[PDB]
Structure 1
Amino acid sequence: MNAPDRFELFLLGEGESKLKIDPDTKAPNAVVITFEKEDHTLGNLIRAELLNDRKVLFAAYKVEHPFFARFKLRIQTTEGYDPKDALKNACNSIINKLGALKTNFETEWNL
Structure 2
Amino acid sequence: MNAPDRFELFLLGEGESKLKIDPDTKAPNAVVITFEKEDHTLGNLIRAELLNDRKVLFAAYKVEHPFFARFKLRIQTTEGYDPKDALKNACNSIINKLGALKTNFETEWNLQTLA
- TM-score between the two structures when normalised by the length of structure 1: 0.94
Tell me the alpha carbon deviations over residues 37-87 of structure 1, each in whole angstroms, 9 at most, x when there is no partner.
000011001000110111100000000000000000000011110000000
Please state whether the residue corresponding to 2:54 is helix, strand or coil. coil
Say whether 1:63 aligns with 2:46. no
Tell me the distance in 2 between the aligned counterparts of 1:89 and 1:50: 8
Closer, same or farther: CA 13–81 of 1 in aligned 2, 3 Å: closer
Q: Which runs of 4+ in 1 moved over 4 A?
A: none
Tell me the alpha carbon deviations over residues 10-57 of structure 1, each in whole angstroms, 9 at most, x when there is no partner.
102423211111000110000000001000011001000110111100
The total of aligned residue pairs comes to: 110
Q: Give the Å deviation of 1:88.
A: 0.3
Q: Aligned residue for 2:44?
A: 44
Q: Residues 17-96 of structure 1 correspond to what in structure 2 (within 5 A)?
A: 17-96=17-96
Please state whether the residue corresponding to 1:60 is helix, strand or coil. strand
Q: Give the Å deviation of 1:2.
A: 6.5
Tell me the distance in 2 between the aligned counterparts of 1:75 and 1:18: 18
Larger Rg: 2
Q: Give the Å deviation of 1:3.
A: 4.7
> Structure 1: any 5+ residue segments left out of the alignment?
none
- TM-score between the two structures when normalised by the length of structure 2: 0.91
Tell me the distance in 2 between the aligned counterparts of 1:11 and 1:98: 25
Please state whether the residue corresponding to 2:41 is helix, strand or coil. coil
